[PDB]
Homo-oligomer: A and B are copies of this chain.
Amino acid sequence: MTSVGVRALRQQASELLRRVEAGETIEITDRGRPVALLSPLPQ
């Protein structure tokens, strides 16, 4: 899942952040429309 909805965000938040921490970016959709991006920080 490279694009997840709001429901999946809550149910999967820990795992989604693990993936971003491993370098993935993940698109967040809201009623099917892409609205936000989760990207890794340089840290």
B9, B14, B27, B33: the one within 8 Å of A13 (CB): B9
Residue contact A35 to B20, C-beta cutoff 8 Å: yes
Chain B proximity of A29: nearest CB distance (Å): 9
B9, B21, B33: the one within 8 Å of A43 (CB): B33
Residues of chain B contacted by A36 (CB below 8 angstroms): 17, 20-21, 38-41
Chain A window 1-36, contacts with chain B (Cβ cutoff 8 Å), 1 for yes, 0 for no: 000001001100110010011000001101001111
User: In this complex, what residue of B is CB-closest to A12?
Assistant: B10
Listed in ascending order, the chain A residues whose CB lies under 8 Å from chain B are 6, 9-10, 13-14, 17, 20-21, 27-28, 30, 33-41, 43
